[PDB]
From a paper:
In addition, we determined the crystal structure of [name] at 3.1 Å resolution in complex with a co-purified alkane-like compound. The structure was refined to a resolution of 3.1 Å and had a typical CYP fold, comprising a central heme molecule surrounded by 13 α-helices and 7 β-strands. The putative substrate-binding pocket of [name] was found to be shaped similar to a cone funnel with a length and outer diameter of approximately 17 and 10 Å, respectively. Notably, an additional electron density map appeared within the substrate-binding pocket during refinement. Because exogenous ligands were not added to the crystallization solutions, the bound molecule may have co-purified with the enzyme during the production of recombinant protein. Substrate binding assay data suggested that the ligand was an alkane-like compound and the electron density was modeled as dodecane. The co-purified ligand was bound to the hydrophobic substrate-binding pocket created by the Met90, Ala175, Ile240, Leu241, Val244, Leu292, Met295, and Phe393 residues. The overall protein structure of P450pyr (best hit in the DALI search) was very similar to that of [name] (r.m.s. deviation, 0.96 Å for 307 Cα atoms), but P450pyr contained no ligand and the loop region (residues 88–96 in P450pyr) between the α3 and α4-helix was missing in the P450pyr structure. Structural superposition revealed that the binding mode of phytanic acid was similar to that of the co-purified ligand of [name] as an extended conformation. Therefore, it is expected that for [name], hydroxylation may also be performed at the end of alkane molecules, such as in CYP124-mediated ω-oxidation.
Cytochrome [name] enzymes (CYPs) are heme-containing proteins that catalyze the insertion of oxygen into a wide variety of substrates. In the current study, we evaluated [name] (NCBI Reference Sequence, WP_010183267.1) from the endosymbiotic bacterium [name] strain [name] 26605. Sequence analysis revealed that [name] has 48.27% identity with P450pyr hydroxylase from Sphingopyxis macrogoltabida and that it contains conserved motifs including an oxygen-binding domain and heme-binding domains found in typical CYPs. In this study, we identified [name] from the endosymbiotic bacterium [name] as a putative alkane-hydroxylating cytochrome [name] enzyme based on our substrate binding assay and structural data.
Numbering used by the authors: 7 to 406
The structure:
Amino acid sequence: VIDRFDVSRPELYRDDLWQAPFRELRATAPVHRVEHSDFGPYWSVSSYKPIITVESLPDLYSSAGGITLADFIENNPTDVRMPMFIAMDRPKHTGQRRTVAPAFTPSEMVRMSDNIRMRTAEVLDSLEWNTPFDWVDTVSVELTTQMLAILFDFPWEERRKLTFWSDWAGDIELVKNEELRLERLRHMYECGGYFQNLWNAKIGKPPTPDLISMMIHSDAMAEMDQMEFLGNLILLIVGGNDTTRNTMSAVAYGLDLFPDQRAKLEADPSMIPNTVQEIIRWQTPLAHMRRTATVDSELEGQQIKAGDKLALWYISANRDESVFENADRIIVDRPNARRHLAFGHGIHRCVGARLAELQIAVLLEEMAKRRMRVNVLGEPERVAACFVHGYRKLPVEISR
Ligand code: HEM
Ligand SMILES: CCCCCCCCCCCC
């Protein structure tokens, strides 16, 4: 079987073959049912306009029946079910989004701007020139995970624990990478235990920004307790680390493919902010999110039935030629670059978007300060998944 339009296949992303099928799907079937399968049947929502209309309709297309193409996958007593306010609806969703959003008030960005800058500086000065190395590990991960260590508190030493994402379950819960039942789950419990210790370490003092803090001593009018954790902090971890990483990893890789557009940026640091957006578009650190139809419905032609599983391929959206012409080129001056769907749309749009915008900016700032230019050597070891989207290894050196 090569459904071709079964764009679930982790092959396409690892090997970088997703461009053509999603080029056709847009031009002849932007809403298309993949009957079978790999994950079970889905609806490939593959274009810009249609996505928006799904995400602006939280009743017709729920977030509280799973949010990636993976499912609950079990009957009755094997418990599981890890809550997450990204996987919520109705009012409760707005309840809990309230209780983390103040971490990303632009004044908090200004407060954290100065620390972020020291660590971005400090990292880039450890780097040596023309000697090869791994952009992913030495920069994109190393920074990124620092940031998540400050958003919780670890503190510092052994913060590499936060690199237990292993949540590429867009391709891990599908006949088991690890048998699973006491593996990704046990990896997740050993996390939760550790964070429970951190929750009990903070039941004195005021709000110490986010780091549990914000879930309690900073009011938290609801957001009680009761293993929301494996869930909410699963969410927070992945959001606050992996997404940014693959972007930093993409600034090195991406720009280098389009070295003229890089040189213009190199010349003009006022381009930076639009550069950040343009890059976040390009990459789409999460290629897709899924909704689930609660009642029967019409959508761009197609006939969605209560039960059906939707699948919003931002990855293809951000290359919709209706909106961004020559989308498969990085163009750092591209005006509308800010209108990408990588952070998403509607009431779920990434609450951390301003922080990721900062982390990247400062990288490209601290880089300009230094006259860097990252030169990619081999091709990168990509991730194999429909959900996460970037790089496990990037081989580079730096010049001037
Ligand atoms: C380049 C960086 C990032 C990208 C591409 C990204 C992407 C996304 C996307 C696509 C969603 C779902 C959007 C939707 O349904 O409309 C989302 C939700 C979320 N992201 Fe991010 N994200 C990023 C950074 C962050 C950071 C830094 C944090 C936290 C510190 C974070 C926390 C979240 C949270 C909490 C949600 C769920 C919000 C809700 O309930 O609607 N993200 N993110
Ligand atoms: C079981 C696989 C789905 C869970 C993946 C973690 C939650 C995704 C949050 C996205 C970060 C913004």
